[PDB]
């Protein structure tokens, strides 16, 4: 048969939407889920989704043939300052292919060896910062750990230095776009959106917009101004060919793939980071087998690419946290056409489909009895994992472009960190995950008394 499709309480015309009034509406479709199962409809006034939290239903969705990535409604909102670099466009869309084709050169085993020295750099400043410390002084961690991965992807991307650590505000680019995400997310709950209550949040929105678009005008400025031959994103991104085309990028385009590089490619890995650091901190002994490790691999004043390379546990506690914690949350699909999903669900081509990665993560039927636990370990034969289990980094063709660079940096700085470093968890910090599309912990807090052991 067909099952009638699972769906949670409904608020006459409101429907579903009710149900997210919220700051923490990913968590709260986690728990949705849970009461509710494998698939949930929710359905708000104007669109529909299914969230799909299974496995089984999540690898039938993965499959290209029948499903393409699909805008959520999220995406959407982001859209309106991302427009269509690769995050915010549509497959089956001229600019999509285009800036794959130009710009994933820029991802290849070779780039990572250059990129490496200027994490270094980075990575270099933290340490550093932290060094500076004195006694009574904590570290703020998803907050410095945000001051490094902007200033990397800024320098390895473009070659701009942000400088995060000289300075004891977050960054102008960060405020602006920490309000524009918060913004994308709240409009999902709107009941009414062309309410006059919303008008100062249209106007702080645009505000916001402007802030992230000047920094790229500041960042294409000075590459013009530049005794350059850099061969990162922004030579490529501004030169490069589509090898299908023979065009290169719009400059349109272009300030578009600035924002999106900017964005994505840094707070997704900022927020593992501080997972990593946080399971760390409450699993004492893992951090004690990573520390060690670690000692023993960086045997190097400052690293190097294959040093990480050997950072065998450390990739793994990062696939852990990214395990429990997946820090960009949810993908969405649609049906190229009318189907039928696992034998139960009919499609209509359209249908939106939505995976919730941080329950995907926990279908117990694949990963043992203990899914909330964290257990660097099940990731020592990646061999035994199912394919379409641990989807962190999104699907097929549609899938995380920057993710190679993301485990390189993280495994880098972790790894210095976990050997510069004595971590005292001083606060029993209890987990409070901030949701702003992407999520992070809130209000973490360590001590970290070093080693004093120079770089
Ligand atoms: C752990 C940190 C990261 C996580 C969890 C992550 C996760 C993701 C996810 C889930 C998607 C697909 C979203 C969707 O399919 O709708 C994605 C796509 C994308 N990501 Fe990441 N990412 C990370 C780091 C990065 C890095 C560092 C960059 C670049 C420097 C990056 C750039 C991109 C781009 C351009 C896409 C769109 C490509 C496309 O769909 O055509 N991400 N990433
Ligand atoms: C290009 C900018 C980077 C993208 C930033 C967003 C990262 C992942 C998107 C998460 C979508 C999660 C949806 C949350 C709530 C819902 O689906 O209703």
Do not use: N
């Given at each position: 048969t067909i099952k009638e499709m699972p769906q949670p309480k409904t608020f006459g015309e409101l429907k579903n939407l009710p149900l997210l009034n919220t700051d923490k509406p990913v968590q709260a479709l986690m728990k949705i889920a849970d009461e509710l199962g494998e698939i949930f409809k929710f359905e708000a006034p104007g669109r529909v989704?299914?969230?799909?939290?299974?496995?089984?239903?999540?690898?039938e969705a993965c499959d290209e043939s029948r499903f393409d990535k699909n805008l959520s409604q999220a995406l959407k909102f982001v859209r309106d300052f991302?427009?269509?670099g690769l995050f915010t466009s549509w497959t089956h869309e001229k600019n999509w292919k285009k800036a794959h084709n130009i710009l994933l050169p820029s991802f290849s085993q070779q780039a990572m060896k250059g990129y490496h020295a200027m994490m270094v750099d980075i990575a270099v400043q933290l340490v550093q910062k932290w060094e500076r410390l004195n006694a009574d002084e904590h570290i703020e961690v998803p907050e410095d750990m945000t001051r490094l991965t902007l200033d990397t992807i800024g320098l390895c991307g473009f070659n701009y230095r942000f400088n995060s650590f000289y300075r004891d505000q977050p960054h102008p680019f960060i405020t602006s776009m920490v309000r524009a995400l918060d913004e994308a997310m709240n409009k999902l709950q709107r009941a009414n959106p062309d309410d006059p209550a919303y008008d100062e949040n249209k106007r702080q929105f645009q505000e916001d917009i402007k802030v992230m678009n000047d920094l790229v005008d500041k960042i294409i400025a000075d590459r013009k101004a530049s005794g350059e031959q850099?061969?990162?994103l922004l030579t490529h991104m501004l030169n490069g060919k589509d090898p299908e085309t023979g065009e290169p990028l719009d400059d349109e385009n272009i300030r578009y793939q600035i924002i999106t590089f900017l964005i994505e490619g840094h707070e997704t890995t900022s927020g593992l980071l501080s997972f990593a650091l946080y399971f760390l901190v409450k699993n004492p002994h893992v951090?004690?087998?990573?520390?060690?490790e670690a000692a023993r691999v960086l045997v190097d004043p400052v690293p190097?690419?294959?040093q990480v390379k050997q950072l065998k546990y450390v990739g793994m506690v990062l696939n852990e946290a990214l395990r429990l914690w997946p820090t960009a949350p949810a993908f969405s699909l649609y049906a190229k056409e009318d189907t039928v999903l696992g034998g139960?669900?009919?499609?209509?081509?359209?249908?939106?489909?939505?995976?919730?990665?941080?329950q995907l993560h926990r279908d117990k039927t694949i990963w043992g009895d203990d899914v909330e636990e964290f257990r660097p370990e099940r990731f020592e034969n990646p061999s035994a994992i199912p394919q379409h289990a641990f989807k962190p980094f999104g699907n097929g063709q549609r899938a995380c472009i920057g993710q190679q660079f993301a485990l390189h940096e993280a495994t880098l700085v972790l790894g210095m960190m976990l050997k510069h470093f004595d971590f005292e968890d001083h606060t029993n910090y209890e987990l409070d995950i901030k949701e702003t599309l992407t999520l992070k912990p809130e209000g973490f807090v360590v001590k970290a008394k070093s080693k004093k052991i120079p770089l």
């Open positions: 989704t299914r969230y799909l939290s299974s496995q089984r239903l999540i690898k991302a427009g269509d850099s061969d990162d951090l004690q087998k990573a520390a060690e190097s690419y294959k139960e669900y009919p499609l209509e081509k359209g249908d939106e489909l939505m995976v919730l990665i941080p």
